[PDB]
């Protein structure tokens, strides 16, 4: 009477659920400019059970991307797998919709964000003592980045602020200085600056 839960019937039956109700996207969150990563699209049932790779040939898989100039996508020789490629620096929001080509019913993934991995303008500036300027910059990750500035001699060229984020500079004395700009992201899970 006490152990009665564990006696399975050795003639294990098969169970077929005839019907995709949710989608997982299995992929990396970061890629380098010029390199590629793979996206795998996992479709599941009303019960959270998967579909086998052998069935994605019957599924209308429609990917969705906001910024195809920063990250491109192609489908592979497996219907379940897509190749992603970094084209220029930035951020891209991605999702996938699977549709039923017999009933028009659809399911969509969560949205995910993939990041692609900056420059200053001008690269050379000339000023007179008492002159002011604001540094301009291009690329990096403009939806996640700090940009901070560091002068090699604050007595020749100083920065205007408290926290050196503004990119405004003031020429104080005759001389020559480097302002290093640094684009940085905070990891939203570990708090790590990169």
């Amino acid at each position: 009477q006490k152990h009665q839960q564990q006696q399975q019937s050795n003639t294990s039956p098969s169970i077929v659920q005839i019907s995709v109700h949710s989608i997982e996207l299995d992929v990396q969150d970061m890629v380098q400019v010029g390199d590629s990563i793979n996206l795998i699209v996992k479709g599941f049932s009303q019960n959270g059970q998967q579909f086998d790779s052998t069935q994605y040939q019957y599924m209308n898989i429609i990917p969705h991307i906001d910024n195809p100039n920063v990250l491109s996508m192609t489908q592979s020789s497996d219907s379940q797998v897509f190749t992603l490629k970094g084209l220029d620096q930035g951020l891209v929001t991605l999702s996938v919709t699977i549709q039923n080509p017999k009933t028009s019913f659809s399911a969509t993934s969560k949205t995910i964000q993939i990041q692609v991995f900056f420059r200053v303008s001008p690269s050379v500036l000339h000023l007179v003592p008492g002159g002011h300027f604001q540094i301009h910059w291009t690329g990096g990750a403009p939806i996640r980045q700090d940009v901070s500035f560091v002068s090699s001699d604050p007595s020749i060229v100083n920065l205007s602020g408290r926290e050196d984020l503004v990119g405004e500079l003031v020429a104080l004395k005759v001389g020559e200085a480097t302002i290093k700009a640094i684009a940085q992201i905070v990891d939203p899970i570990t708090g790590k600056k990169t």
């Binding site: 195809p68 999702s95 919709t97 549709q99 969509t108």
Partner: protein, 292 residues
């Protein structure tokens, strides 16, 4: 007894702005509303003696507009818990709202934290455009009478290869159809093999992001006992672009905060309502199966 259930009523707090979108293109709009600081919707407070002054920090980026527009009313005359904002020039501007009594307007009861609205620049090249929901057929070709023998349709790929239009739309039997995915397609309409007579158009594929109930050419802010007014339901994307065809999945619902003041009826995307008793009422409208 076949059941018991227990509503908690709290009688208490403050105000905030609400919108499902905060980007707008130049020339697009978004409808804003107030919601309370516990979560009080215009369905639980909207009929009360509350009068709402709205304001915008710069009116050259984006302007406020009234709801009953065509009666020649203003936002200050409406005092409404819901208003419009229209994009004029690119940039971010901030909108603020204060709640007063309708009897006492000398001092506010509550003030909201200000919402930013970020206006996006247009590209000023008049380009025939559609915006379709996912998995949805479009009647556009029949509606513009582009059905006619010797018209031809060709999807246009980007030179970087990015627009695989096959992943966003199909085109067959003089129809257009959107697919499972968010994106943009470009298409030429050619005729008689001639590229020199041809035309170009855009198709966007997106989910619905925002919903707007607005009066169809009102003569007043008010609806007759025994008479009626009609209100159109607009659906917008994440930049305020209006969907050109809603598909057969866009089912609407309507709810009424104080019963027997009005009756409502919906046909297609139009709510017609009729006056039955004297009073104030909030009408609520939502997309049935996406009630956010």
């Amino acid at each position: 007894i076949i059941g018991e259930d227990k509503l908690m009523v709290y009688v208490k707090t403050g105000i905030r702005i609400h919108s499902s979108i905060n980007k707008i293109l130049v020339g697009n709009e978004a409808k804003l509303r107030v919601v309370g600081a516990n979560g009080e919707t215009p369905f639980t407070y909207g009929t009360v003696d509350l009068f709402f002054k709205w304001e915008c920090l710069d009116s050259n980026i984006a302007t406020l507009l009234p709801i009953y527009e065509r009666a020649n009313t203003t936002v200050e005359a409406e005092g409404s818990f819901s208003v419009r904002v229209m994009g004029k020039n690119a940039g971010s501007t901030s909108i603020t709202v204060w709640a007063y009594s309708g009897g006492d307007k000398t001092k506010h009861l509550f003030q909201a934290a200000s919402l930013q609205i970020n206006v996006i620049p247009d590209i000023p090249i008049q380009t025939t455009s559609l915006l379709l929901p996912l998995n949805t057929p479009s009647s556009f070709i029949v509606n513009n009478h582009l059905d006619k023998t010797g018209i031809e349709f060709y999807p246009l790929m980007d030179g970087h290869g990015s627009s695989s239009c096959k992943d966003v739309i199909d085109i067959g039997d003089n129809k257009i159809v959107s697919l499972d995915k968010i994106g943009t397609c470009y298409v030429s309409a050619v005729r008689d093999g001639r590229m020199d007579t041809s035309k170009l158009f855009k198709i966007n594929s997106k989910p619905f992001s925002h919903l707007e109930l607005l009066p169809i050419n009102p003569t007043s802010t008010v609806i007759p006992i025994g008479g009626s007014m009609s209100f159109a339901i607009y659906l917008r994307d994440d930049i305020g672009e209006v969907f050109t065809e809603y598909g057969s999945s866009a089912i609407f619902s309507s709810e009424v905060s104080n019963t027997g003041i009005i009756s409502s009826s919906i046909d297609a995307n139009v709510v017609t309502i009729k006056g039955i008793r004297a009073g104030l009422v909030t009408l609520h409208v939502y997309l049935k199966d996406m009630p956010h």
